[PDB]
Design an enzyme around this catalytic site. Structure first.
Site, short mmCIF file in Angstrom:
data_model
loop_
_atom_site.label_atom_id
_atom_site.label_comp_id
_atom_site.label_asym_id
_atom_site.label_seq_id
_atom_site.Cartn_x
_atom_site.Cartn_y
_atom_site.Cartn_z
CB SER A 23 109.10 34.42 34.81
OG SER A 23 109.06 33.68 36.34
CG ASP A 137 97.83 43.83 27.07
OD1 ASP A 137 97.90 45.01 26.62
OD2 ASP A 137 98.18 42.74 28.04
NE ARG A 141 102.08 44.60 24.70
CZ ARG A 141 101.12 45.88 24.34
NH1 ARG A 141 101.31 46.24 24.07
NH2 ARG A 141 100.51 46.06 25.75
CG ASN A 142 99.60 40.41 24.74
OD1 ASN A 142 100.61 40.57 24.79
ND2 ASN A 142 99.31 41.57 25.32
CG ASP A 155 99.80 37.55 26.89
OD1 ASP A 155 100.08 36.50 27.96
OD2 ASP A 155 99.84 38.63 28.06
C1 LIG Z 1 108.57 30.37 21.81
C2 LIG Z 1 108.56 31.89 23.21
N1 LIG Z 1 108.98 33.14 22.30
N2 LIG Z 1 108.54 34.12 22.11
C3 LIG Z 1 109.09 35.67 22.73
C4 LIG Z 1 109.16 36.05 21.39
O1 LIG Z 1 107.83 36.04 20.51
C5 LIG Z 1 107.51 34.03 22.97
C6 LIG Z 1 107.07 33.11 22.97
C7 LIG Z 1 105.83 31.98 23.24
C8 LIG Z 1 105.59 30.82 23.07
N3 LIG Z 1 103.91 30.49 22.89
C9 LIG Z 1 103.92 31.05 23.74
N4 LIG Z 1 102.55 30.05 24.44
C10 LIG Z 1 103.58 31.68 24.67
N5 LIG Z 1 105.25 32.41 24.38
O2 LIG Z 1 102.85 32.05 25.68
C11 LIG Z 1 104.04 33.66 26.52
C12 LIG Z 1 103.11 33.64 28.18
C13 LIG Z 1 103.39 34.86 25.37
C14 LIG Z 1 104.28 36.05 25.15
C15 LIG Z 1 104.45 36.98 24.34
C16 LIG Z 1 102.95 37.62 24.01
C17 LIG Z 1 101.43 36.69 24.27
F1 LIG Z 1 100.27 36.47 23.82
C18 LIG Z 1 101.91 35.33 25.20
CL1 LIG Z 1 101.06 34.36 25.32
C19 LIG Z 1 105.67 35.40 25.73
O3 LIG Z 1 105.51 36.34 27.03
N6 LIG Z 1 106.78 35.43 25.45
C20 LIG Z 1 107.57 35.51 25.92
C21 LIG Z 1 106.21 35.39 23.79
#
Ligand SMILES: Cc1nn(CCO)c2c1-c1cnc(N)c(n1)O[C@H](C)c1c(ccc(F)c1Cl)C(=O)N(C)C2
Ligand SMILES: Cc1nn(CCO)c2c1-c1cnc(N)c(n1)O[C@H](C)c1c(ccc(F)c1Cl)C(=O)N(C)C2
Lengths: 257, 272
Positions: A23, A137, A141-142, A155
């Site tokens: 999560s 990866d 999306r990342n 990611d």
């Molecule tokens: C505020 C928010 N809303 N959303 C959903 C809409 O984009 C996300 C974020 C968010 C913000 N800041 C971060 N550093 C962060 N996530 O880091 C996650 C670990 C992350 C992902 C996805 C890809 C990815 F590169 C990474 Cl690093 C993720 O899990 N999300 C849920 C993305």
């Protein structure tokens, strides 16, 4: 000293609501200067701390930095590692591209802004490849949007992003990351389309073996399509480095009026 | 009675030749095929195999009764059922006219690729909507519930007109709010799936609710949130798809009202 600097004291961290499901949660991190920083917390032994120490020292504007690692000790004494990352309100690039196609979302993304996204990811990937670090990866999306709307790589199964040789063998090089980059360029140019419409994940290797590649998007400049097509050359040695890619994109962005 | 429902839709198995798989799944595969007609000539067909629960004859009873309705469907915007073949453990197969042009959803995505069909103009997108609305109006008039209306289930005929197909013979983002809560289903639930289908066409193949997950859908809908207006979409066209998603099923227009709203809108646009 190696794993000691990457580990963050657990009481400096306050967890919040889930952002996505290991999560991902929003959180607050208390910093040295007394202020609190908004963070994203990814829930995932001593070898993990070594690769986290590697990512911690990455310092580039188009690369997401790893603030540290928190060890959550459960009531039954079992450790749970947590990756601490800076919070980016604007989220991921894939979601951003899709919202741009809706009236309530961001404005229609012009070609100059789509190209700057590609340049951003290419500068980040060039930085990582120079450090001989594999992403493994890479996909829209990342890729994350910073508060100033610049793109950062983050990611660092997804069949439709995996290079032909990586699907056959288990081999993964910087040229496999170059293929995933080409696919990512296509995702941005189509403003969020899933790769290979009409092709199922199980048919992908045979489709690729027969020499078929992602088709040119409708409103895509031939010069831009040449750059993404070069990423999917059957022989990885024919694919350009991220350094060649980055400059081709910057020069293409420069040529636009 | 079990053989009576069979006799009206049944085609002798030796009149059918099975070819290559066009699509596969868990509950059955789709194959291309040849069907020998009574005039001696052969017709290109699509053959849908369906693995039914053979522990009782209730699923074959449900299948045959649906196939009886499907055989009598006669409208240009509704796919006809050619018949039913039995592979013998009995395994029924649905025989359908072969449509080389495939499904609408895949066609819409392809149109966004230089080598694929040309950029679909607004007039041709609206014409697709009118064709599905005529097909659904024909079904609603006969009190036939579709239950699986989506662009992926709309097929293009050789003349590029669209026809309603599949007819839910047996997904969350197409299901009406009242159908998510309780197993309840009406022609108004089909009107909801139609508004979702109109949105798919207008966005040229986007997945509904970007940023929203399937497990968050019921809660998202109950809070009054709906599919957002596409960027280039006319307010008048968005008014029509929005009317399909009114919380109360009785507030949603019938397919007959929708069809005319779309036909009139199409006429208000230039021939260009
Ligand atoms: C505020 C928010 N809303 N959303 C959903 C809409 O984009 C996300 C974020 C968010 C913000 N800041 C971060 N550093 C962060 N996530 O880091 C996650 C670990 C992350 C992902 C996805 C890809 C990815 F590169 C990474 Cl690093 C993720 O899990 N999300 C849920 C993305
Ligand atoms: C030639 C072809 N290529 N493709 C893949 C590209 O669309 C398809 C067909 C095809 C053609 N003609 C038919 N009557 C037919 N299928 O009937 C299927 C039973 C059918 C679907 C899908 C939706 C749907 F409404 C129906 Cl009726 C299906 O399984 N397909 C694999 C679609």
């Amino acid at each position: 000293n190696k794993l000691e600097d990457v580990v963050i004291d657990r009481n400096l961290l306050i967890l919040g609501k889930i952002l996505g499901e290991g999560s991902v949660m929003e959180g607050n991190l208390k910093q040295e200067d007394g202020t609190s920083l908004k963070v994203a917390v990814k829930t995932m032994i001593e070898e993990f701390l070594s690769e986290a120490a590697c990512m911690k020292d990455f310092s580039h504007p188009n690369v997401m930095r790893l603030l540290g690692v928190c060890i959550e000790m459960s009531s039954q004494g079992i450790p749970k590692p947590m990756v601490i990352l800076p919070f980016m309100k604007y989220g991921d690039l894939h979601t951003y591209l899709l919202y741009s196609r809706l009236e309530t979302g961001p404005k229609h993304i012009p070609l100059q802004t789509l190209l700057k996204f590609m340049v951003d990811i290419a500068l980040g990937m060039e930085y990582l490849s120079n450090r001989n670090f594999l992403h493994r990866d890479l996909a829209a999306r990342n890729c994350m949007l910073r508060d100033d709307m610049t793109v950062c790589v983050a990611d660092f199964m997804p069949v439709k992003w995996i290079a032909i040789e990586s699907l056959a063998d288990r081999v993964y090089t910087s040229k496999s990351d170059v293929w995933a980059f080409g696919v990512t360029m296509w995702e941005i140019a189509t403003r969020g389309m899933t790769p290979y419409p009409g092709v199922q994940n199980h048919e992908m290797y045979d489709y690729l073996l027969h020499g078929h590649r992602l088709k040119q998007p409708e409103d895509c400049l031939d010069e831009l399509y040449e750059i993404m097509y070069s990423c999917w050359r059957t022989d990885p040695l024919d694919r350009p480095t991220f350094s060649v890619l980055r400059l081709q994109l910057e020069k293409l962005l420069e040529s636009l009026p």
